[PDB]
XYZ file of N, CA and C in Angstrom:
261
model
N -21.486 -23.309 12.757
C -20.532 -24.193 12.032
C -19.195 -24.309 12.737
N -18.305 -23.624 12.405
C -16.781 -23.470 12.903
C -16.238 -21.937 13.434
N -15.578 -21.244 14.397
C -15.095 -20.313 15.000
C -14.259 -19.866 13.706
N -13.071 -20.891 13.469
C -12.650 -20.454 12.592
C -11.343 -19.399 12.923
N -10.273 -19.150 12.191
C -9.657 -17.694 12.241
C -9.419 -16.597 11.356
N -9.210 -15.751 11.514
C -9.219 -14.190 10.606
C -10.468 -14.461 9.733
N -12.106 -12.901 10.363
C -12.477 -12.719 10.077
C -12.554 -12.827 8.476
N -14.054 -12.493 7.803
C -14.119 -12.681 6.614
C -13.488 -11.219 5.993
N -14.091 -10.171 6.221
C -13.601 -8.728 5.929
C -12.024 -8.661 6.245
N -11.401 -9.244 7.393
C -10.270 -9.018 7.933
C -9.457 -9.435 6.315
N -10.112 -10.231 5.802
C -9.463 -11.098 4.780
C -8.673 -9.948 3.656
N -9.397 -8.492 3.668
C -9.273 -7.959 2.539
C -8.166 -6.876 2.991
N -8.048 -6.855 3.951
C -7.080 -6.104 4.778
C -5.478 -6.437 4.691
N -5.959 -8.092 4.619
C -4.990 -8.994 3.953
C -4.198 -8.717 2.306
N -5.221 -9.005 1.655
C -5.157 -8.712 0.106
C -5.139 -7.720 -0.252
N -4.946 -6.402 0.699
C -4.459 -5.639 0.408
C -3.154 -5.016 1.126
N -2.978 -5.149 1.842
C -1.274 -5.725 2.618
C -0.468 -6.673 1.909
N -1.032 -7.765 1.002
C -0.383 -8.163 0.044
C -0.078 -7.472 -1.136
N -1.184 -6.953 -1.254
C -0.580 -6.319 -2.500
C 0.750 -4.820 -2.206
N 0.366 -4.172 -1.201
C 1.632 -3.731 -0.812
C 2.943 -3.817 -0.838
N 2.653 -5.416 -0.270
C 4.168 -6.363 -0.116
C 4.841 -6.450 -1.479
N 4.153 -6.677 -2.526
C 4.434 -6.661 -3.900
C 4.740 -5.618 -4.374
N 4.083 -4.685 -3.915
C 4.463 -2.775 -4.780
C 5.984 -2.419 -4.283
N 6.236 -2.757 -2.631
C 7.508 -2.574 -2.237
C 8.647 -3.215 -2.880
N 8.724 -4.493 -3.145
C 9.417 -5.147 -4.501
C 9.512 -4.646 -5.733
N 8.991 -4.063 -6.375
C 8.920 -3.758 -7.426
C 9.448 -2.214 -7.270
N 9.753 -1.500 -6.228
C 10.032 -0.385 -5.726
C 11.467 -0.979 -5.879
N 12.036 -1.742 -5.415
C 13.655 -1.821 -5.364
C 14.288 -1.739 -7.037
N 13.124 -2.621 -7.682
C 13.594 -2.680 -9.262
C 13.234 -1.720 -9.962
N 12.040 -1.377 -9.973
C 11.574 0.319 -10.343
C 12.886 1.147 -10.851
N 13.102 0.979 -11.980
C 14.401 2.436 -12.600
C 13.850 3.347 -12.733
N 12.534 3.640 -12.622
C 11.988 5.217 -13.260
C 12.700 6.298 -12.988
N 12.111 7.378 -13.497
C 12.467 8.593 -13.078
C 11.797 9.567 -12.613
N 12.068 10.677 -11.844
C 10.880 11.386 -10.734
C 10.269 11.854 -11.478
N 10.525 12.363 -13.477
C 9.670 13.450 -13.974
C 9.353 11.727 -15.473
N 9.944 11.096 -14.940
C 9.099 9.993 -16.013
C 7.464 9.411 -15.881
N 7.052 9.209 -16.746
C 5.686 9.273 -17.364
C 5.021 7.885 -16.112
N 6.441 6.696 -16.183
C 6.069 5.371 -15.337
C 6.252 5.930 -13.788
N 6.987 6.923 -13.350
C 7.088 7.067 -11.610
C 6.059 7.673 -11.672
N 5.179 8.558 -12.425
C 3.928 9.003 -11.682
C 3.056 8.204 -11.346
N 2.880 6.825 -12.346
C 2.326 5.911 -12.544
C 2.631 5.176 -11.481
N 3.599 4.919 -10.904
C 4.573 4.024 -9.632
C 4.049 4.721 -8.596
N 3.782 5.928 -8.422
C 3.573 6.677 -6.924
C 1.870 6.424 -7.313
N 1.493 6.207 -8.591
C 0.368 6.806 -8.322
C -0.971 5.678 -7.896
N 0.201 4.460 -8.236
C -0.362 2.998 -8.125
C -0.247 2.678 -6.404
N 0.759 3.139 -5.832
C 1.141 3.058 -4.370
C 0.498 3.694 -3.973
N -0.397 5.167 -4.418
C -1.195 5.852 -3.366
C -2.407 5.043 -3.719
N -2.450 4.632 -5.158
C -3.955 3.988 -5.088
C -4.903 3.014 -4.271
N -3.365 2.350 -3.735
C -4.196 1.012 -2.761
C -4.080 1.542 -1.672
N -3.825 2.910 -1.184
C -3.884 3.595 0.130
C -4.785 4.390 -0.380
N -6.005 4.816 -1.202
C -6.980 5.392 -0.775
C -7.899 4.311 -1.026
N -7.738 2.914 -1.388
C -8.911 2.265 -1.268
C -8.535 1.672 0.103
N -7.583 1.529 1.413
C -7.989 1.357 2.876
C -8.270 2.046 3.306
N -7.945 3.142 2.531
C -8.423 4.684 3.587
C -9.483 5.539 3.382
N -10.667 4.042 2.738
C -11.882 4.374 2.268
C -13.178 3.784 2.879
N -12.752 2.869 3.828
C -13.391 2.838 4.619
C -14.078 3.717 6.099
N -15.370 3.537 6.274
C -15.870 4.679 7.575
C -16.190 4.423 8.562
N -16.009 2.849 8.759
C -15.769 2.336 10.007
C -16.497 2.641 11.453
N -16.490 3.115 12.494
C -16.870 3.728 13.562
C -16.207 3.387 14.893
N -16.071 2.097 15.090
C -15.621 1.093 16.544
C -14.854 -0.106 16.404
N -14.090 0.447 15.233
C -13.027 -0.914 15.033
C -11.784 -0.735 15.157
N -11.278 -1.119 16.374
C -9.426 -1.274 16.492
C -8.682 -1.804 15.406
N -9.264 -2.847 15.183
C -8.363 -3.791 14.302
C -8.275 -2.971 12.963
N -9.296 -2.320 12.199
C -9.373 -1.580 11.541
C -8.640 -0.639 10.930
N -8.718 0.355 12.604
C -7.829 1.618 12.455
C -6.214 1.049 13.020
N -6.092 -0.026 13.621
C -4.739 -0.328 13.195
C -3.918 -0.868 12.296
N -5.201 -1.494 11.380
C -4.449 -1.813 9.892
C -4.364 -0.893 8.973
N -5.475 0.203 9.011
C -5.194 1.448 8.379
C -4.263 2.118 8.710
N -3.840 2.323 9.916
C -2.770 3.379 10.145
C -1.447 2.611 9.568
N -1.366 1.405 9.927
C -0.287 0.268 9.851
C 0.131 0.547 8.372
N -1.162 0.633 7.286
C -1.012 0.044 5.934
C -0.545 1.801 5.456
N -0.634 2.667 5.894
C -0.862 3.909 5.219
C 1.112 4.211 5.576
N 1.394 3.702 6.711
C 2.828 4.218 7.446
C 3.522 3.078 6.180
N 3.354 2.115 5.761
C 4.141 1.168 4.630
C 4.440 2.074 3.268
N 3.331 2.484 2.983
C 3.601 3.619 1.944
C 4.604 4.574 1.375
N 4.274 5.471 3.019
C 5.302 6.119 3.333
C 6.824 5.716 3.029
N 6.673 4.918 3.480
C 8.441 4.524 4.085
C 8.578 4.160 1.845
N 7.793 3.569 1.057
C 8.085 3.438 0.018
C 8.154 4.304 -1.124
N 7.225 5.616 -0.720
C 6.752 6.795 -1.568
C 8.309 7.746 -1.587
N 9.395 7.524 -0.174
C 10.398 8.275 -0.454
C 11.450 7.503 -1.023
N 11.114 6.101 -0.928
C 12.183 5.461 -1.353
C 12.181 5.737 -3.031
N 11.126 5.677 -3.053
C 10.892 5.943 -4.718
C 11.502 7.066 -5.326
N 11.069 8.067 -4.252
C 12.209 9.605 -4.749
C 13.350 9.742 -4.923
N 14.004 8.539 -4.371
C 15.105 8.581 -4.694
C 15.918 7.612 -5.465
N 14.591 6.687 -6.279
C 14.832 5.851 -7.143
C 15.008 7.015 -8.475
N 13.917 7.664 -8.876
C 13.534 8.737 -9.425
C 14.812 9.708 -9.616
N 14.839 11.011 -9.865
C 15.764 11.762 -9.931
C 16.090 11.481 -11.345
Protein backbone atom coordinates (compact mmCIF):
# COMPACT_ATOMS: atom_id res chain seq x y z
CA UNK A 1 0.00 0.00 0.00
CA UNK A 2 1.90 3.13 1.40
CA UNK A 3 5.54 3.37 3.38
CA UNK A 4 3.94 5.70 5.33
CA UNK A 5 5.57 7.33 8.70
CA UNK A 6 5.90 6.34 12.45
CA UNK A 7 5.42 2.77 12.78
CA UNK A 8 2.11 1.30 14.03
CA UNK A 9 3.48 0.19 17.67
CA UNK A 10 5.79 3.33 17.54
CA UNK A 11 2.29 4.95 17.80
CA UNK A 12 1.87 3.89 21.49
CA UNK A 13 5.13 5.12 22.54
CA UNK A 14 3.54 8.20 21.40
CA UNK A 15 0.33 7.99 23.54
CA UNK A 16 2.17 7.39 26.05
CA UNK A 17 4.72 10.31 25.92
CA UNK A 18 1.57 12.14 25.63
CA UNK A 19 0.21 11.25 28.32
CA UNK A 20 3.34 12.21 30.24
CA UNK A 21 3.26 15.58 28.67
CA UNK A 22 -0.06 15.99 30.48
CA UNK A 23 1.00 14.47 34.00
CA UNK A 24 3.94 17.14 33.88
CA UNK A 25 1.21 19.95 33.67
CA UNK A 26 -0.76 18.97 36.10
CA UNK A 27 2.51 18.61 38.26
CA UNK A 28 2.94 22.50 38.17
CA UNK A 29 -0.81 22.84 39.48
CA UNK A 30 -0.78 19.80 41.71
CA UNK A 31 -1.12 21.56 45.50
CA UNK A 32 -0.91 18.24 47.21
CA UNK A 33 0.92 17.32 49.94
CA UNK A 34 3.89 14.71 50.39
CA UNK A 35 1.81 12.81 53.27
CA UNK A 36 -1.68 13.71 51.40
CA UNK A 37 -3.91 10.90 50.37
CA UNK A 38 -3.91 12.79 46.39
CA UNK A 39 0.30 12.99 46.15
CA UNK A 40 0.45 9.32 46.64
CA UNK A 41 -2.08 9.11 44.11
CA UNK A 42 0.03 11.89 41.89
CA UNK A 43 3.37 9.87 42.24
CA UNK A 44 1.54 6.90 41.98
CA UNK A 45 -0.23 7.77 38.63
CA UNK A 46 3.35 9.07 37.25
CA UNK A 47 5.00 5.79 38.15
CA UNK A 48 2.06 4.04 36.63
CA UNK A 49 2.61 4.99 33.00
CA UNK A 50 6.36 4.19 33.66
CA UNK A 51 5.75 0.65 34.49
CA UNK A 52 3.45 0.15 31.62
CA UNK A 53 6.78 1.30 29.09
CA UNK A 54 8.85 -0.44 31.20
CA UNK A 55 6.82 -3.47 30.46
CA UNK A 56 7.79 -4.26 27.53
CA UNK A 57 10.65 -7.31 26.62
CA UNK A 58 11.66 -6.30 23.56
CA UNK A 59 15.12 -7.92 22.45
CA UNK A 60 16.72 -5.76 19.27
CA UNK A 61 15.05 -2.55 19.34
CA UNK A 62 16.92 0.87 19.53
CA UNK A 63 14.10 2.88 19.03
CA UNK A 64 12.54 1.11 21.85
CA UNK A 65 15.15 1.22 24.43
CA UNK A 66 15.55 4.82 23.56
CA UNK A 67 12.09 5.73 24.19
CA UNK A 68 12.15 3.75 27.28
CA UNK A 69 15.09 5.17 28.72
CA UNK A 70 13.93 8.70 27.26
CA UNK A 71 10.31 8.18 28.85
CA UNK A 72 11.53 6.77 32.32
CA UNK A 73 14.39 9.99 32.67
CA UNK A 74 10.84 12.46 32.16
CA UNK A 75 9.56 11.01 35.29
CA UNK A 76 12.28 11.54 37.12
CA UNK A 77 12.87 15.05 36.54
CA UNK A 78 8.80 15.21 37.66
CA UNK A 79 8.71 12.66 40.66
CA UNK A 80 11.15 15.39 42.49
CA UNK A 81 9.46 18.17 41.34
CA UNK A 82 6.51 16.83 43.02
CA UNK A 83 8.48 16.56 46.36
CA UNK A 84 8.68 19.63 46.51
CA UNK A 85 5.25 20.51 45.53
CA UNK A 86 4.35 18.19 48.53
CA UNK A 87 5.81 19.02 51.93
Amino acid sequence: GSPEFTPPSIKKIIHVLEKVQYLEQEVEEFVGKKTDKAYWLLEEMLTKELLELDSVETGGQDSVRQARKEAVCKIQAILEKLEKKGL
